[PDB]
Amino acid sequence: QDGEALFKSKPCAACHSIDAKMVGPALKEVAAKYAGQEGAADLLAGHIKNGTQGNWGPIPMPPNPVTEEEAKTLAEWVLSLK
Ligand code: HEC
Ligand SMILES: [Zn+2]
Numbered sequence: 848q849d850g851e852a853l854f855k856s857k858p859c860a861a862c863h864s865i866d867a868k869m870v871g872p873a874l875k876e877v878a879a880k881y882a883g884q885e886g887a888a889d890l891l892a893g894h895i896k897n898g899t900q901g902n903w904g905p906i907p908m909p910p911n912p913v914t915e916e917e918a919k920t921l922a923e924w925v926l927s928l929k
């Protein structure tokens with residue numbers, strides 16, 4: 848599956864929109880923040896799979912039910928969002 852397909856088949860939409868702020872940052876805003884940051888795809892892939900907190904606010908993103916390979920597809924897709 849591609850990034851947009853995984854975005855809908857995994858639980859992401861409970862907390863994220865592509866364009867609007869929900870629980871987590873809008874995915875276009877993640878793309879904007881990490882544009883030009885060397886290494887961002889691997890960083891986001893680990894965060895999508897394993898969870899993270901404190902990059903955008905106090906609310907954490909729990910770990911997600913994704914494989915490495917799904918997390919990498921999703922991270923590359925998120926970074927592509929313009
Ligand atoms: C609520 C329970 C969430 C679900 C389900 C998913 N995400 Fe999330 N995400 C959420 C929050 C609250 C945050 C911000 C955390 C913080 O650091 O303040 C995030 C963050 C992201 C990011 C950005 C990470 C970064 O390093 O800046 C991405 C790319 C992201 N989330 C993607 C993502 C995907 C692909 C999900 C489905 C697999 C997903 N999230 C689930 C909240 C929640
Ligand atoms: Zn597609």
Ligand SMILES: [Zn+2]
Nearest residue numbers: 912913914917
């Ligand atoms: Zn899967």
